[PDB]
């Protein structure tokens, strides 16, 4: 009991600091200024002049023109002070792609009794019940009655709107003039007709002010029985590999972290081979192995994620006129997992209390004595601090230019505490009783009044120590 409690305790502490450093490094969270604003600019906008037909509450099933020629039209032609400018914070990228899942004839069998009324509506997702003929008016493939299974896309398996591997879809040009013309053609005709169950679209962004990539997916699940459900899944992904003098420190911390994980994995195998095995009913050997297993992950994920992201970002120019550039959806499928896995063990790892009792929090909440003592000091320190302020304001009021207004003497004295004295005109304004002020203020503020605070802290620590020792030795 003289080595371990002094060995893996220290090792775990250093492990804690090491992980918290690159937790800070990872903790960018620029989304609140780069994904919240991006989402508001793309999901908080009025389709009409002023109404409730926004992205929050979809307009209507027959509002194809009212919806596509709206905030969506403000994504291909974002005109501000065909264009990419909404709030001077984001730009365009890739090529737009909208999927119109039309549930055409095949919803239910049509008997000879009452098929003449209705037999083809927007039913649940299926294969032989989806779009099989023109979903309304379409001369050719405007309402394309083809299954896009070979489109290199995986179904989202949506709960509110079931997602399949097939469905009518089309892309837009490098601008919105052609996109608007196609939308108008499909509105005069019928492609997103009443049989359409849900509409899906995916998009990317550049946002050159804060260099990153944005992946956004928009889904409007207009139920056949009425209404429409909005869904917006938007998330960023950046690549900052090596340009700075701080990210190299993060890389070094990651290397140190990998060495620590190697140390803990080369240490755990011996506890099962040499030490008696199949003994995990301790709840402590349980965390030791699961933490290591999770830590092995996100190491072979981060490298793979970085490599894949770099490879994908390399080909970011050939998509100006390319047909489809919405293949990055596979990337986020990993990026969020590493965003989740990293927080599925950083708590778990910090959830280790073998070194000190968990239920002994009675000495971390009875420290209110320290808080009470710290309050009977602020009312014994501000009395002396305000008397000096008054004296300075009365003696040096008219001359110094710093002890001019009472609200300024306070800040001047605080700056004096921070070692920002001037003393060029404090003494000039009054040869005697002026330096006396400064000397006594320094002697009573740094020697006799500062140290009572440290004494209070010292006594709080000693009392906590003594109480804990008495409790644990009773």
């Amino acid at each position: 009991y003289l080595k371990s409690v002094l060995r893996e305790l220290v090792t775990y502490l250093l492990f804690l600091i090491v992980l918290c450093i690159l937790t800070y490094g990872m903790m960018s969270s620029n989304v609140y200024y780069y994904t919240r604003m991006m989402s508001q600019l793309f999901l908080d906008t009025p389709v009409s002049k002023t109404e409730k037909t926004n992205f929050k509450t979809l307009s209507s099933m027959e509002d194809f023109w009212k919806f596509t020629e709206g905030s969506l039209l403000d994504g291909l032609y974002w005109k501000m002070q065909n264009r990419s400018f909404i709030f001077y914070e984001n730009l365009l990228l890739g090529v737009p792609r909208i999927r119109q899942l039309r549930v055409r004839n095949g919803s239910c069998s049509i008997p000879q009794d009452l098929r003449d009324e209705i037999k083809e509506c927007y039913d649940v997702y299926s294969v032989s019940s989806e779009d099989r003929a023109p979903f309304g008016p379409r001369n050719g493939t405007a309402w394309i009655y083809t299954s896009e299974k070979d489109l290199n896309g995986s179904s989202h398996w949506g709960i509110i709107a079931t997602y399949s591997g097939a469905g009518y879809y089309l892309d837009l040009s490098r601008t919105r003039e052609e996109t608007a013309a196609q939308v108008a053609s499909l509105k005069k005709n019928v492609w997103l007709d009443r049989g359409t169950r849900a509409t899906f679209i995916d998009f990317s962004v550049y946002n050159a002010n804060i260099n990153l990539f944005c992946v956004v997916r928009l889904l409007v699940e207009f139920p056949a029985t009425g209404g429409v459900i909005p869904s917006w899944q938007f998330q960023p992904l950046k690549l900052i590999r090596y340009v700075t003098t701080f990210d190299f420190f993060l890389a070094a911390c990651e290397i140190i972290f990998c060495f620590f994980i190697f140390y803990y994995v080369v240490e755990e195998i011996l506890e099962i081979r040499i030490h008696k095995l199949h003994y995990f009913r301790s709840f402590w050997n349980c965390l030791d192995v699961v933490i290591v297993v999770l830590s092995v992950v996100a190491i072979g994920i981060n490298i793979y994620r970085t490599s894949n992201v770099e490879v994908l970002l390399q080909f970011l120019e050939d998509q100006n006129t390319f047909p489809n550039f919405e293949h990055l959806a596979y990337w986020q499928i990993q990026f969020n997992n590493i965003a989740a896995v990293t927080v599925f063990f950083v708590w778990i790892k910090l959830f280790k209390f073998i070194n000190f009792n968990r239920t002994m929090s009675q000495l971390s909440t009875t420290m209110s004595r320290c808080a009470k003592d710290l309050f009977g000091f602020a009312i014994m320190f501000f009395i002396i601090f305000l008397a000096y302020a008054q004296l300075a304001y009365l003696v040096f009021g008219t001359q110094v230019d710093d002890f001019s207004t009472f609200q300024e003497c306070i800040f001047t004295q605080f700056r004096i505490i921070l070692g920002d004295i001037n003393f060029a005109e404090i003494e000039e304004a009054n040869r005697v009783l002026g330096p006396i002020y400064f000397t006594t203020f320094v002697f009573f503020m740094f020697f006799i009044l500062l140290n009572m605070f440290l004494a209070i802290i010292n006594d709080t620590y000693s009392e906590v120590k003594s109480d804990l020792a008495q409790q644990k030795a009773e």
Binding site: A208, N211, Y242, V243
Partner: protein
């Protein structure tokens, strides 16, 4: 930001116009000894 792939082709007086033979402004391939100035935007080398 907006970095890319460093050019490596040959050019002429003014810029790119290889007409007859070797360009007047050759690439002068980097040596493997002496590089890595470590500027601000990226880590550079002795090629150019």
């Amino acid at each position: 930001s907006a970095a890319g792939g460093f050019s490596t082709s040959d050019y002429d007086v003014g810029w790119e116009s290889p007409h007859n033979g070797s360009g007047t402004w050759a690439y002068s391939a980097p040596d493997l000894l002496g590089a890595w100035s470590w500027g601000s935007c990226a880590v550079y080398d002795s090629g150019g």
